[PDB]
Structures are given as C-alpha cells and as structure tokens.
Amino acid sequence: TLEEVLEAPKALEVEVDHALLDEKGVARLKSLLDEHPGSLPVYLRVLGPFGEALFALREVRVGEEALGLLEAEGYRAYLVPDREVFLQGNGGGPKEEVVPF
Amino acid sequence: HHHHHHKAGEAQDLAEGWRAFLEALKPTLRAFVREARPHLEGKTLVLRFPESKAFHHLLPLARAQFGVEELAFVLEKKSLSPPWEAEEGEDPSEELRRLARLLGGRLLWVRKPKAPEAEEPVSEDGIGGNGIMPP
Amino acid sequence: VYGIPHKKAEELAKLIPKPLQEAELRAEMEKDERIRQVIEVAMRLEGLNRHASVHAAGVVIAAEPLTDLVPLMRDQEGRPVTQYDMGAVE
C-alpha cells in the first residue's frame, strides 16, 4: 500500500536528458556524485531517442544532502522509493506500515 | 459572483475577509461588498445599468461611494489567518520544514494531537519521524 | 562594442530591473561558473566613466577668469567646455 512504499527506505533519482557527450568524458556527473557519500542508491532516467531507460548507478551511495545541492545545477533530482527494497515481511514491517495510514 | 460560488463552506467566509476593501467589519455589511458592486455596475458595461444606482443617489464606481478608511488585510496570502512540530512551536517552524508554503501549515495546526492525518493523506507523520531520525 | 551574439547577454540584461549592487534574481549566478566573473567584473566597471562630454544647456559666466578657478576643455565641435560638472561648478 501507499504507506508501505513511503516508509520503505527511499533512494535518489536524477533524470538526465539525452544531450550529454561521452568523450568529455562524462566525468562531470561522476565528479559531483563523489563528494557526498552515504547509503542511497542512485537511479538515472535517460530519455533516449526511443524508450525510457532505467539505470541504477554503480558504487556511489548518496547521503541525502546531495538532492538539494544537485538541484542547484540543471538536473531534476527526486527522493523516490527504492525499488530493490520491495520484498520480505520483516524489519519494517507490514504491521508497522499500516500504522501511519 | 464566481468566487461566491466556489464557496466551500467556511472557505469563503475567510475569503471575503482576506482580499477585502472593507471598513473594519464594514458598517451595515455583510461580506462580500463585491456582491453589491456588480449589482451597482450591472455587467457587462452597460450604460443603462451603472447610471441607475448613481442616478438614485466597476472599481471606480465602487471607490466612488464608499466605506474605505480602515485598511486591514491585503492578499491573497498575507495572513490573519511524541515528535510533533515541535518543540515548543511558533511558527516559523523550529524543527522541520519548510521552504514554505510549509510555514503556513504549522499556523493552522496548533493543537495538540499528532497524526492524523486529516483531509486526509498522509505525509505529516513521515516528515516528522524522518526529522527525528537524524540526531 | 559592435553587436555580436547578445543571445545569453540580452537574457542576462533583461533580468536587471538599477545597479548590480542590488540586482534579486542572483540565482542565475550559481548555475554556471563563466557568468560569475562577467557580473562581478561588470559591477566593478559599473560607475566608471564612460567618457564624455558636454551639457546641452550648461553655460557658466564667471566674474574673474575661469582659468583661475576652473580648468577647461574644448570639444569636437569647438566649444570651450568646463572640466567640472553641474554640481561642482555651483
């Protein structure tokens, strides 16, 4: 349910456009993700020429400060629910996710 | 009268108060005074309509009366008008939020039950618990 | 100084209401690193002359010779111009 999603640990998601060359080489995105370590999986929505792609990042885990400081630049970040979390029936749990509703 | 329709119960009882042009509750009135003004004018123009009331005796015809003096309210926004807020509580907020509008949500709030949510769903508990999670 | 691309310049120019000392849309400065210096240099070159010149109606009639108390110039069209301005002459 909605409250089960909203409580489950959230993750950072940036939505970058197609317009970005590879042989600069795209180190700008990698440099700005380095400075803010933590524990949030970074997702990338690349609106390509045909089909909306889904790209979870690599090693970098954000610390929930890099959302606002990234929106300062020409990127549209979000604090979306983490996809990988959706499973199991403990830790939260499903009882505790009914409490906020 | 389009505003007078939008009327969501007690919604417009404050709306008439907030963008005003009244006279300290306004003698012999009423709220709105902007109900009478278009009756005086008689929309759209219309020559055989705004004369009627002036002959017996929109905005300029309304300013031509009128119970002006007072000067209260302005917008359209202005005002007047375990975890919780908190700390304490003003507003401005002293724990969470806001990059307001959010400010405004803490002033209608007090007091003093938590949750709920009301109206209803559903993020005032989450933002609260999330704000407690960073000690 | 000639009229070349005023593409982003006209956009930056239209943000001004006034001097750059007050000018409130400064959020444009944090975006790019190039335009930080453009503004900062511009406001450093703001009040500077900028040259000139003569006054449409300005005429002085001194009792003793002007050259004793006020220094002089001569413009392009051959007018004896005062080096001080309105306020300084008065």
UniProtKB/Swiss-Prot annotation, chain A:
Compartments where found: Cytoplasm
Top-level division of the source organism's lineage: Bacteria
Subunit structure, as described in the record: DNA polymerase III contains a core (composed of alpha, epsilon and theta chains) that associates with a tau subunit. This core dimerizes to form the PolIII' complex. PolIII' associates with the gamma complex (composed of gamma, delta, delta', psi and chi chains) and with the beta chain to form the complete DNA polymerase III complex.
Family: Belongs to the DNA polymerase type-C family. DnaE subfamily.
Role, per record: DNA polymerase III is a complex, multichain enzyme responsible for most of the replicative synthesis in bacteria. This DNA polymerase also exhibits 3' to 5' exonuclease activity. The alpha chain is the DNA polymerase.
The protein's name: DNA polymerase III subunit alpha
UniProt gene name: dnaE
Parent sequence residues shown: 1120 to 1220 of 1220
Curated annotation (Swiss-Prot), chain C:
Annotated protein name in UniProt: DNA polymerase III subunit alpha
Lineage: Bacteria, Thermotogati, Deinococcota, Deinococci, Thermales
Top-rank lineage group of the source organism: Bacteria
Protein role: DNA polymerase III is a complex, multichain enzyme responsible for most of the replicative synthesis in bacteria. This DNA polymerase also exhibits 3' to 5' exonuclease activity. The alpha chain is the DNA polymerase.
Quaternary structure and interacting proteins, as annotated: DNA polymerase III contains a core (composed of alpha, epsilon and theta chains) that associates with a tau subunit. This core dimerizes to form the PolIII' complex. PolIII' associates with the gamma complex (composed of gamma, delta, delta', psi and chi chains) and with the beta chain to form the complete DNA polymerase III complex.
Source organism per UniProt: Thermus aquaticus
Family that this chain belongs to: Belongs to the DNA polymerase type-C family. DnaE subfamily.
Subcellular compartments: Cytoplasm
